[PDB]
Amino acid sequence: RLVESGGGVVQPGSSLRLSCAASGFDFSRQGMHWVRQAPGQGLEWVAFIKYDGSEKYHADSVWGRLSISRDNSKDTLYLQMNSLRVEDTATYFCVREAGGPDYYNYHYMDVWGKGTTVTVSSASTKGPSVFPLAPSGTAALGCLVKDYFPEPVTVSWNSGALTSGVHTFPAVLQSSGLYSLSSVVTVPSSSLGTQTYICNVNHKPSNTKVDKKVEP
């Protein structure tokens, strides 16, 4: 078993130190890895350290900012993260290299920690900017929620009155560091100009509530 910690949400340029506490096996005799995975992305190797810490390898993307290291008397693996970048956002896993006699690395990873998250973000707590997406015998319309931080925000229609045909999509994280998402409801073309359509956007962290009227 392995347990990561030290993670959190920091600003680009700040520094952070991850620690993975190990148990149930002899630590000083085995090599260790750090692997990160961006949200909705694939795996990426970060660093590897030999059992005795006499050698360490780092990935070209995290060179030379992120430094692996270990204390064998504390049975701990460390990751020191400096000059952090927005691209450093990911879940960092403490991982064990499989080994044994004739240890000698077997070149596969047999044990994983549940992982510790790290979020490097420029953004500060901020209210959502809501803009209507207007319909051009079924019409499609919706609201555009833009530039809010952090997740989540909930969106209803006509104050929960209209639940039929509503799709609130996942939010995209823009390079600026701010989230944006859309919500669309499918309605009969005939009801337009007749029925009023309103979306209710609610941001809890910033305590922002906004109602936008959507019309042709």
Partner: protein, 211 residues
């Protein structure tokens, strides 16, 4: 530099499928250390293959591995629902670093395949007066979810200022995804038209909007 895998495979239950991992002679073609990892949502990877042919104790005999040249392949016989997940290959490189595949999303198939519904929204007038512009390409009702999204101003490809979601599941047993295009009001008005081309299972659907 990542080892290249196919973004996605899919198969009917009972079907045999194959995933390819193509490296160079300095990692995949230079060593026997290629290993393969299965990953479920919200869980940590588990090794299903190592030393390129070998199964770790506890793994089904339905998983095999092979290597030809610089391309190593994982092969799953008799797909069962529980095989659905993302698959990553790991290789050792001449400098003794490790490198991972780009990943493969494997779908054991519940229902028949389904193509995406594509809606494109021009920038709202409230936003135009805000001195910003954004195009919203909304994708829905497709399966298995894997989609290439591509934007074109006029007939010209546009790689600048586009963010796309990872396909997410709907209540109706089909996926959904979105792609947003950031532009300046001048850009929006300057160009003739803007296109959204969604490539799903080798097939592209396209919608278009203009000032």
């Amino acid at each position: 530099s990542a080892l290249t895998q196919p973004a996605s495979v899919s198969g009917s239950p009972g079907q045999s499928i194959t995933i390819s991992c193509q490296g160079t002679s300095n990692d995949v073609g230079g060593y026997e250390s290629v290993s393969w990892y299965q990953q479920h949502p919200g869980k940590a990877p588990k090794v299903v293959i190592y030393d390129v042919s070998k199964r770790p104790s506890g793994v089904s005999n339905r998983f095999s591995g092979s290597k030809s040249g610089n391309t190593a392949s994982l092969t799953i016989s008799g797909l069962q629902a529980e095989d659905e997940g993302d698959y990553y290959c790991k290789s050792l490189t001449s400098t003794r670093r490790r490198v991972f595949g780009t990943g493969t999303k494997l779908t054991v198939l519940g229902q028949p395949k389904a193509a995406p519904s594509v809606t494109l929204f021009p920038p709202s007038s409230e936003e135009l007066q805000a001195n910003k512009a954004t195009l919203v390409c909304l994708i829905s009702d497709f399966y298995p979810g894997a989609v290439t999204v591509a934007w074109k101003a006029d007939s010209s490809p546009v790689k600048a200022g586009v963010e796309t979601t990872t396909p997410s599941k709907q209540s109706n047993n089909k996926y959904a995804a979105s792609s947003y295009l950031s532009l300046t009001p001048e850009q929006w008005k300057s160009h003739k038209s803007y296109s959204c081309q969604v490539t799903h299972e080798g097939s592209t659907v396209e919608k278009t909007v203009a000032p």
